[PDB]
Amino acid sequence: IVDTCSLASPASVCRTKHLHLRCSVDFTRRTLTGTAALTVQSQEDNLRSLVLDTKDLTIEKVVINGQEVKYALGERQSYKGSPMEISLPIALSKNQEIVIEISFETSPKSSALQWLTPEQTSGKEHPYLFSQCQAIHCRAILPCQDTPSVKLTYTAEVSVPKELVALMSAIRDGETPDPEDPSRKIYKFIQKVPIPCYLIALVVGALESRQIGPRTLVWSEKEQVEKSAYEFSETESMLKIAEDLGGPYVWGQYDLLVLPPSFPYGGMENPCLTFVTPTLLAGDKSLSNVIAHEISHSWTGNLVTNKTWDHFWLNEGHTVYLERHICGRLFGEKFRHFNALGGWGELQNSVKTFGETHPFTKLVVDLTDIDPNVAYSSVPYEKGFALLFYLEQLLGGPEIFLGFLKAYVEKFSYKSITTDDWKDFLYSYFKDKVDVLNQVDWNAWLYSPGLPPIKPNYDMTLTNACIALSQRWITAKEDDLNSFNATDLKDLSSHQLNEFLAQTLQRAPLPLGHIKRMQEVYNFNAINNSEIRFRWLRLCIQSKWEDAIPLALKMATEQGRMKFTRPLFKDLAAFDKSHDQAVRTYQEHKASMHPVTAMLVGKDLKVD
Template sequence: MSAVPQGEPELLANGDKKKYKFVQKIPIQSYLIAIAIGKLESRRIGPRSHVWSEKEFVEQAAFEFSQTEEMLQTAEDLNGPYVWGIYDILVLPPSFPYGGMENPCLTFATPTLLAGDKSLANVIAHEIAHSWTGNLVTNKNFEHFWLNEGFTVFAERKILGRMSGEPMRHFDALGGWKELQYTIDVMGQDNPLTNLVVDLSTVDPDDAFSKVPYEKGSTFLWYLEDLVGGALKFEPFLKSYYEHFKFQAIDSNQFRTYFLDYFKDENEKTNQIQWDAWFNTPGMPIYRPSFDESLAKVCQELKDKWIQWNESTPSPFKADDLKSFLAAQKEEFLALLMLEDPLSVKKLETMEAAYHLNDVNNCEIRYLWIRLGLKGKWTNAIPRAVQMVTEQGRMKYLRPLYRDLYAWEETRTTALKTFEANKPNMMKVAIQGLEHDLKLAK
């Protein structure tokens, strides 16, 4: 559970039950209390970490999350001491609707992270960051959810930058910017739920859940860091903020007051901040960071080559095109194509023949490739889309794929029938979102 185990399980007098004891000495919010029960095995992956899962996945999970201790140490260097004692990871069944859940001492993780090459393990950096941003300092309520998730995305990318270099931090943020743009396009530019601070007085927080507090919140912090003079000034502020508000639940005004007091000698800079515009204006952020796009350049070039290719000429593409690409660059290449007009079926078939993307295990790449096929009305993508929405329940993938299936008239019935067939295996929050997407909400 979300606490530290105490000793070995105690066999009870009747001999058919065991008693497990846990202690949590640090005050936590009620939503962070978690208990998991199942036929589980574990493997040690660091001096303060185990990974837990059903036996079929435990070795794969131990390999996938083997960098956990390095991430923890990097996070401590950035944020201050890790106060929770242990950091374990539990791989949940596929119906789990999120990438992860930051329960103290025991992160819940989706099995969609098990890519086989550690390429999706950055989600663990996100959950580790929550040990400060959300668990140590918590939003007062979910109208101020960005104080949890915006800070966490910002810290996660700081960890990524320290482990893999600043260009990778920028590259990841560039991808997040595109995800934010897609989210706001779907929700509507004027939708008040795309504000950084939202009014939930008449809205179920689950219905308001989106990428906005994650990416818009992270962008706001990036802006503030740039404004006050960069990381050398802003990172000490972050440590001070976590220390000042630890074990408390706060709102956005408390953050603003503390920020302005901390940087009281920088009035010329802080007076430029349009707090109301950041907090209460819908749509995209009013500031776009100056991203280092060096890792994106080859993705853009390959995308342009595909767009410009005249199909009446021989294909110039080969498997080596992607040989030097990181998994994240393959994602970016496909994400860039998603922003263009639909590819023809011939181009999609040629791409599959060259790159064999149908066989990729990385769920981010697989998901984008399916969406690209559906956008181009390639019937080959339909069974792969149905398979992906059936074998896992992560909303990040479910909702766009179901929207795409519903939007294509030829597959609308397939979307509705697949949803009804899969509904008994889904968690409530996923069902609610999909009923809205599929026009079934009452």
């Protein structure tokens, strides 16, 4: 097992045990400067050098035993960055530990960071910075073994302009004036649980907080605090359910940070401080499954970790499985099945986009010379979930399979594992059902592209009305459109409206007159729920309604969640009437987008 996405020495050669980060955030230069002190343990005899990952980092010096040591930056290897070899002053024996202090500065173009001007924030008076290290962007902040096969503790001291606040994926450990610059404050942090370095995270900005549970504050700019406190009020109830299913919550605090609209994901499971998109702020808590998902990562992902990114499905599939159990406990088993069946539809969509033979539709994926951001899709989420849901039904039901899940978390806590470790423990836990496990087509499920070889069984109770109404619209002729009316929606929840739109979008385009009628009688243009609005606008653009062009351009640019922004830009580029404007709009906005999102939209549009 080799991590083909890292250029650093592997864990079999040496292991980082601890990071002590002292840095300063310079908004004038858009740089982070400081020192990263790595406590490294040799795993072999006579160790005289080691290699760290870096990406667009300027290295000033490397200090061991109080003296500068020799180092060399190799040539850049595309998205992987540049390897940094350090010559150790004294050969190390196996299990010997030393401290290596590296003085470094980031580049303004760091792919881990987005620097925001005051005008890009809610308050309009202060700048803002946030990080996103998953999968392999931590090396664009600091030199490290940038592989999830290594887990380390960390402490940090971050100097910032005194008007602003710093937060990290760690427990807050005090603040003080910066003695080297009275215009600044130093914020301190401690992460005492070993983590993979992709879970290191930093935000700096004009942040305020409100308590919403016994172990949860929500953080945001002042303009969003009140709405966020209401939107995420289910958090503590979800944590209690998650603890019941996964075992103890070991991280102390579970805080939430609501980022500015360019944050690229629904959430990011940064330990002690989950990051979330403001597109969750629907006003009715209806997108709270994203919080259940990030909560669940506190066990599946953050405690039990994928050893390499080839095995990412271990993180995401088990987390989606726990996510849907949390929402099933809250709202019922029929709702769990409804969301499960919706996820199968999303798997169908991903497979249909990539193509049924595409290597990125395999559950286990070989990322040799593949940028993980390019490979990312809903496949590991939903093919992984589908495998676990299938096994649940094969092995005796959800109560039995949740017993496996808790035992799995306990077995591999604080470790990094592969698909074969998972499968071996599955066969160990279910030793009395090995004959049943040997009926599984393991090669198809784990290593073949396309849809899985067997579809699970799904309760249809909550889905039937969505399918029925979608089919009424698809089979309607012009003389049937008069029969549709706002009353068609009166018994549908927001989740069901979203699924009605998903069902109909799968058959797009529809005739333009149908889409116009849908707006006339359902007024979907008025809905601000981001998931509903996204699917409605995709349906309008794919059905060639020119009126929807400005709406789709607005949504694609006024937020930056990649799930929404990328498909909206792609749909607009595919519609001949909006193509030129889509490209011009991307070019005008690209410099102020998140660096990774800008790169991907450019690839999607075939723009340079």
